[PDB]
Design a protein around this ligand. Structure first.
Ligand code: ZRN
Ligand code: ZRN
Ligand SMILES: *[C@@H]1O[C@H](CO)[C@@H](O[C@@H]2O[C@H](CO)[C@@H](O)[C@H](O)[C@H]2NC(C)=O)[C@H](O)[C@H]1NC(C)=O
Ligand code: NAG
Lengths: 342, 354
C-alpha cells in the first residue's frame, strides 16, 4: 500500500557494530565541536538518551562520556526536573536538555534529549552503554516536544519518512538505513503491515504456531517490532506453554546441527500471510545448550496480548522497513527475507 | 505486495511540458505525420481515444486553431473501409473518421497509431477553447475504435519505457509536467501511497467516504474515485452535489482578500481505506471573477450508478502528485498519490515504481 524508497542517492547507511555485550551500536555526533557516541537504535522507545560526564558511576566512567560543558550548543531544559525510566533489565535517570546532533550526513538542531545521570534502581554493569536513539512514535516521549526522527525529517526535506534494519551479526555487517531500503539487504518481495496504534511499531497478529500446536491467537493479539531486545517475546500467560513445546537441549559447535533436526517450526500469522522461523533460526548456543531465543514480556497497554520480535530471533532473518506516516497517512512495517551472509 | 522507487536513466522517463492556457486547458505538444505537423493536445486519463483536429473540419471553432492537414502527411493512411466516430459528453460532442498515422511524443515515435480525425464539433464549449486534440490515457476498453491504445502502442514500440506515467500540476509557476515511464522525486515529498484500481475502465479506485468539516457527505453505498485529468474540477453525483454547495458557498474574493474570507471554510476529507486526503479551502476554492467558488461540478458516471467521484487537475492534482501504474495479469493497476512539492522547479533525476 506504500512505496518504499530505493534510489541509491536518497538512502543513507549507518553501519551497526554488534558488540560482544549483545549491543548493536551505531555512530552519533553530539554537540559542537562534535563528540562521538555509540548508541543503540531502538524501535521500542522514542526518547533519545546520551550518557554524560555528570554520571561518575562505575558503569558510566568506563565509556566515552559526553561532556556537555565542552559543547557550545548544549542547553539545559526544564532545569530542576529529573526523568526516570525503569524497564526489565535496569533503570535510567537523568536531566533534560537540548543539543545539536549529526547522524550520518544529516544535522539536527534544537533537539530535545535526556542526559543520563544515574543507572541505579543492573545490566549496565554488563554492557558498555552510551545512549539510545529512539525510533518509536512521539506519543512515547517521556519528555520533549518532537521525536528525534520526526525532527530529523522535518529538517531534511529530501528524505522519505522511512528507515530499515539489516541484522547480520555473523560478519558484523548490520546496517541502519535512513530514507528507504536497499536491494543489497533483502531478496524477494516486501510485504507491508499497517501500524494499528502509533505508539510502538505495533501491527495486527492473527496467530502463532509451534509445529501443529497453535499458541495463538484466541484473543485479539498484536506484534511489536523492537530492535532494543535481541529476544522474541511472549506474554506471561502464554509463556509457560511456549517453552513447553520449545525445550532447551545440549548442543555443541558440531552437534547443534543434529540436535535441532526434530524441533518444530514457528509460524507467525499476519492475516493470510505466514512467516516461518526454523530451529536454527530461533535457537542459540548458550554454554553447550540449545535454548529458544525467547523471553517473557507483558506489554501493559495491550492487556498482555502483544508479542515482540527482536533483532536476533527475527530481524536477523527478515529485513524490516519502517514507514512513518504523516497526517492521514498510515504507518507501516515492511518485512522481507533478509539476504543472509556466508 | 509493495512497490519501490528505483532510479532510472533520464531517457526512460521523458518530460512533456504542459502549458496552462487561459481557457483552462493543460496542453502539451504532439507531432503528427511526416513532415511533422504540430498540434497542442490535452492529456486525459478519462478517455483513451486519440483525437486530432483536421482540415476536414471547416466549422467556425476548428478554423481558429492549427488544424492537421492529413493530405500533407506522407505517413497518414485511411483504411479502405472507413469507420465513422461520434462522441458526446457533457460540454459538447465530437465527430470524425478513423485513420492511422505516425506520432512523436517526447522524442519517441509511434507508428500504425489509430486515431480520430475531428470533422465536426457541433452539439458548445469548443467555442470557449482552442482545441487541437486529445491524448487519451484511459484503458483500452474505453477505445471507441482501434485495436491498440496510443499508450499501449507507444510502450509496445519503445521497450525502454515502463508502463507508468505521472502528472505534476503547477499552473502558477508554469512548471506543470507530464511524465511518461516513471516519476520524479523533484515533484513530491513524503511517501507515495498506492491505491488499487477496482475496474480497468477509468482510473477508478474504491472510496470509503467524504467529509466537509464534520458533515459526512458519503458513503451509504459502495462508492468509487476516478482520477480524471480531463476536468480541472472535482465532481460529485447529483444526489450529493446539492448538499455540497449548500455547505460550501461562494464568496467575493480578490487576489489579496481571499486569505481571510477563506480562513473559516471547512476541510474536505477523502477516505481511501487507511488513507485520508484533505483539501483546504484555499486548495479547493478558486478565484473566478471576484468570487471564491468551490472548484466542483456535478457529474454522474453512468456505469457506477452515480456513485463515482472525480478528482480534477486544479482541485486535486495541483496539491497531490499522482502516478499511474498499469498492471498485467494477476497484478492490478494502481494510482499512486503523494504530497506535491510546491518549490519544485525542474525534474533533476527520474525513477520508476517497482
Ligand atoms: C529504555 C528503552 C528500552 C531499552 C532499550 C526499555 C525496554 O525495556 N525495552 C525492551 C527491553 C530490553 C531489554 C534489554 O535488556 N535490552 C538490552 C539493552 C538495554 C539497554 C541498553 C542496551 C541494550 C541492548 C539490549 O540487548 C530487556 C527487556 C526489554 O523489554 C522491552 C521489550 C520493553 O518492552 C517494550 C525497549 N525496547 N526499550
Ligand atoms: C472526450 C474526452 C473528455 C473531454 C476531454 C470527456 C469528458 O466528459 N471528460 C470529463 C469532462 C470534461 C469536461 C470539460 O469540458 N473539460 C475541458 C475540456 C474539454 C475538451 C477539451 C479540452 C478541455 C479542457 C477541460 O477543462 C466536462 C465534463 C466532463 O465530464 C468528464 C468528467 C467525464 O466523466 C468521466 C473527460 N475526462 N474527457
Ligand atoms: C505497421 O503494420 C504493418 C502491417 O500491419 C507492419 O508491417 C509488417 O511488418 C512485419 C515485421 O517485419 C512483416 O513481417 C510484415 O510482412 C509486414 N507487413 C506489411 C508491411 O504489410 C509494420 O511492421 C507495423 N509497424 C510497426 C510494427 O512499427
Ligand atoms: C526550540 O524548540 C522549542 C521546543 O518547544 C521551541 O519552543 C523553540 O521555539 C525552538 N527554538 C526556536 C528558536 O523557536
Amino acid at each position: 500500500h506504500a512505496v518504499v524508497e530505493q534510489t541509491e542517492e536518497n538512502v543513507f547507511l549507518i553501519p551497526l557494530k554488534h558488540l560482544r555485550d549483545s549491543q548493536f551500536v551505531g555512530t552519533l555526533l553530539v554537540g559542537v565541536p562534535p563528540q562521538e557516541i555509540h548508541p543503540i537504535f531502538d524501535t521500542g522507545s522514542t526518547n533519545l538518551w546520551v550518557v554524560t560526564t555528570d554520571c561518575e558511576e562505575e558503569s558510566c566512567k568506563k565509556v566515552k562520556r559526553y561532556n556537555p560543558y565542552k559543547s557550545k550548543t548544549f542547553r539545559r531544559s526544564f532545569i530542576g526536573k529529573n526523568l526516570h525510566i525503569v524497564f526489565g533489565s535496569g533503570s535510567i535517570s537523568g536531566s533534560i536538555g537540548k543539543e545539536t546532533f549529526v547522524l550520518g550526513d544529516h544535522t539536527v538542531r534544537n533537539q530535545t534529549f535526556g542526559l543520563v545521570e544515574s543507572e541505579s534502581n543492573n545490566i549496565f554493569d554488563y554492557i558498555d552503554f552510551e545512549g539510545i536513539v529512539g525510533l518509536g512514535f512521539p506519543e512515547m516521549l517521556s519528555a520533549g516536544k518532537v521525536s528525534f526522527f520526526d525532527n530529523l525529517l522535518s529538517q531534511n526535506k529530501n528524505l522519505s519518512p522511512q528507515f530499515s534494519f539489516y541484522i547480520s551479526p555473523e560478519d558484523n555487517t548490520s546496517t541502519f538505513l535512513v530514507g528507504g531500503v536497499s536491494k543489497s539487504f533483502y531478496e524477494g518481495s516486501i510485504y507491508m503491515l499497517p501500524v494499528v496504534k502509533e505508539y510502538y511499531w505495533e501491527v495486527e497478529l492473527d496467530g502463532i504456531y509451534v509445529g501443529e500446536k497453535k499458541i495463538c491467537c484466541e484473543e485479539k493479539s498484536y506484534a511489536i517490532f523492537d530492535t532494543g531486545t535481541s529476544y522474541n517475546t511472549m506474554p506471561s500467560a502464554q509463556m509457560k506453554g511456549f517453552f513447553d513445546v520449545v525445550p532447551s537441549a545440549p548442543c555443541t559447535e558440531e552437534n547443534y546441527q543434529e540436535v535441532l533436526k526434530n524441533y518444530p517450526v514457528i509460524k507467525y500469522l499476519f492475516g493470510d500471510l505466514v512467516i516461518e522461523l526454523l530451529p536454527e533460526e530461533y535457537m542459540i548456543l548458550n554454554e553447550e545448550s540449545c535454548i529458544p531465543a525467547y523471553m517473557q514480556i507483558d506489554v501493559p497497554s495491550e492487556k498482555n496480548h502483544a508479542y515482540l520480535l527482536g533483532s536476533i530471533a527475527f530481524m536477523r532473518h527478515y529485513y524490516t522497513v519502517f514507514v512513518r506516516g504523516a497526517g492521514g497517512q498510515p504507518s507501516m512495517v515492511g518485512v522481507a527475507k533478509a539476504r543472509a551472509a556466508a
